[PDB]
Amino acid sequence: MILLDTNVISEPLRPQPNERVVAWLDSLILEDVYLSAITVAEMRLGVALLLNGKKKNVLHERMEQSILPLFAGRILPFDEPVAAIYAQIRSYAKTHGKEIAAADGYIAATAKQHSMTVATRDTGSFFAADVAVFNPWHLEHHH
């Protein structure tokens, strides 16, 4: 399954969405894509911090009445078990120089437990987490 990080699902909503990315999102089976409660927290906070006006309001509705509901049942929580993975994903990174930040750890950790792939623009961190990543911004080649 695929776990979408904040920056990937944010792209389409931008002024000039990245063509390649959108296309990628378009080649997926919704029921296969998930979201970490963390990422949902962020998306909602990102919305809440806007200036009051039409844009914010519309976007809010779209968020609660359109986007998120598509992910019902697939928004992953950061529960006690995930916490174990977390502690190990970060520790293992520190003892290899490459540091991983809490937020990224939460997301990574989540992904790892359910053995998923993180789709992010910043694969930079996640590789050190020993978890599969995919940059929708880049291309795909041979194996």
Binding site: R14, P17, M43, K54, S66, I67, L70
Partner: protein, 67 residues
């Protein structure tokens, strides 16, 4: 992508060759199609385009970093 279907009964196989021929195409073209239609049927929603619309609706937004 590519995929190899091993252990395909000659019966089914011949059935598919027949289908393709009858339909005026190659077997690999027939399977590609058969699968495509199925895939088209599962594709309930298109996440990208779906989100894109919203963007286009509010004229795009740049959401604060935060992390």
């Amino acid at each position: 992508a590519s995929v190899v279907i091993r252990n395909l009964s000659e019966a089914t196989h011949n059935a598919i060759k027949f289908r393709a021929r009858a339909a005026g195409r190659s077997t690999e073209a027939e399977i590609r199609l058969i699968l495509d239609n199925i895939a088209k049927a599962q594709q309930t929603v298109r996440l990208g385009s779906m989100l894109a619309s919203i963007g286009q609706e509010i004229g795009g937004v740049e959401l604060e970093d935060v992390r």
